[PDB]
């Protein structure tokens, strides 16, 4: 399953941009992983 994970990661992006760049980069990598699969 990639759909709910994409949804959720999307929402903690749009909820907390104030996270340090580390979390943003890691989470974007996670979304790139899910759409790659």
């Amino acid at each position: 399953e990639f759909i709910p994970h994409i949804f959720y990661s999307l929402h903690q992006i749009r909820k907390d941009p104030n996270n340090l760049s580390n979390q943003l980069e890691t989470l974007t990598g996670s979304i790139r992983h899910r759409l790659k699969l």
């Binding site: 974007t28 979304i31 790139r32 759409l35």
Partner: peptide, 27 residues
């Protein structure tokens, strides 16, 4: 060879395509 032509004919293929493009722009 006609398989990919049939696949490109249905809209949701284009949908996944520009969805990938939009995430590429976002990243």
């Amino acid at each position: 060879t006609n398989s990919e032509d049939k696949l490109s004919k249905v809209q949701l293929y284009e949908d996944l395509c520009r969805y990938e493009d939009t995430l590429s722009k976002l990243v």
